[model samples]
Target: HMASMKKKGSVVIVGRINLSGDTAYAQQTRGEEGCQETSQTGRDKNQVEGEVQIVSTATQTFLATSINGVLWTVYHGAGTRTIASPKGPVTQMYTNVDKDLVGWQAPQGSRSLTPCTCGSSDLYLVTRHADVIPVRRRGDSRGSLLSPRPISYLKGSSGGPLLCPAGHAVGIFRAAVSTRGVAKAVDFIPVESLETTMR
Candidate 1:
């Protein structure tokens, strides 16, 4: 069954932000509720002098309207820019080509500051083949996954919202777990978790 499943695109971690300032000092300066920070260095990984900000790039389908009156789009968490080719600096990259860079937009609004939620009503995934289609979630709960393959044929589809049948937003696609080339689970960050960062 897995052999027949062809992947459209693989998961790519993009938008790596290199920090020049002190990681701890930034935290102290920003305080506990701060949203921006560098990725934690794992075992044996090189801990850079400053910090590294990494966010997975995905589609802008789900927008959260926070109490702050601004909108928010979820990323793996949550740039470079230049005018010229070589000198301009590579700001963003994916499995494809790294284009000349520009700017990274920060999430806005008090609503963007707040998070949202979704109940397990009829769940669906918006997909595109030759055309756009809404694929029903295989199971009733957010725990259910439509594809077990590591690579989603619906590549670049992360950061999209999981919708209820009534067209309600439930969750934002977060990460995927793949065993070999075939992925088993596509996970999401609950809206509650997103809100927790506000503290």
Candidate 2:
């Protein structure tokens, strides 16, 4: 017996995306372009100011959460298993899964760049060394504010905000730099580029 099913209507269509979410993620840095390399722009010693934004809060203990202006790993527990409407606004823009990627292990001075989280999460640790890289590399530096040392440690505070002197987030704490020196540095990710990623 020959069995043939009726053919359903078929059409060819292109693929596109639209994102509409409230939260986003990115790496942090100390300052823009070699500020940590030179001295004109008070290097690491330069104080930066910024705030974290709470992005996700679900049931199945998120791998991490943004709290009190920091990003913390979710304790061993059950959190929501999904981000319900993170993609209801624009073109597949917002990303909770991608945001959670920061908690993972990175190079000594480089970690995943993510949206800033509130500092009031269960897993929030601060390190004086961990810093951000700025968008543009500075030229004439003065008075070595903070020496450009390779990253040493990045355990608890993986995806935290590393503001720069001018309040700009340059990069994220990736991993250790076993090249020339011993210290680590934040992987500089341009803000303008960041805005483009989210767009």
Candidate 3:
């Protein structure tokens, strides 16, 4: 048994408001009978509270809308286009970033909010604001990273935000980090860029 795949799939559809504010709600489709959103997830790690908030009190996301199997979202970014219809943030963005890029949890942090022996609890990620990212990560290095490794592990890094040093919006958290705990890195999706792609 695989227990549970624990994934958001390739691309999830979300309602604009669902992924906004400090809490993201998982709402059920209209008239789904007993379906109602009532829970939320954290926006950042607990122990490494640099400029981030709490998982219980941080930014959140949800399947904005699921119609005929299509998912709509409220992701923010530039050049974003609104394809169909729905009320959302005055502005919206859209894109197709993969889980490996912006949806992994940090396995190391899951071990505990505290850092390990090497004394490194330095968690990092790309800002959701597409404008802040480097576009092409010279040899697979986007946003900001070291050339040699220029990548992160994705073990237990789900639902965390991957932001730029400038404190701008970036991507949300998603997977895990084993094998050196690299997946623990932020699987960021350009917030600004995705914002514009919204339909």
Most lDDT-accurate candidate: 1
Residues 1-199, candidate 1: write the lDDT tens digits: 9889832221112222222233211111111112111111111111212111122212222121122221223333222211111122122221111211112222221112223244444454432121122434443223344444346554544444455555444555544555676645555544444333333
Poorest lDDT segment (10 consecutive residues) of candidate 1: 35-44
C-alpha TM-score for every candidate = 0.37, 0.30, 0.27
Model 2 stretches with alpha carbons more than 4 Å out: 1-50, 53-145, 148-152, 179-181
Q: How accurate locally is residue 70 in candidate 3, as Cα lDDT from 0 to 100?
A: 22
Q: lDDT of all predictions, in order shown? A: 0.31, 0.26, 0.26
Ranking by TM-score: 1, 2, 3
**Candidate 2: 10-residue stretch with minimal lDDT:** 10-19
Best by TM-score: 1
Off by over 4 Å in 3: 1-123, 126-157, 176-186
lDDT of 2: 0.26
Please give, for residues 1-199, the per-residue lDDT of candidate 2 as tens digits: 3577632211100010111123233323222233213222211222222233112222111122222222233222212112112111111122333323222111121123344333211111223222232222231111111344443343333333444443333333222334465433333222333344444
The local lDDT score (0 to 100) that residue 94 gets in candidate 1 is 18
Candidate 3, overall lDDT? 0.26
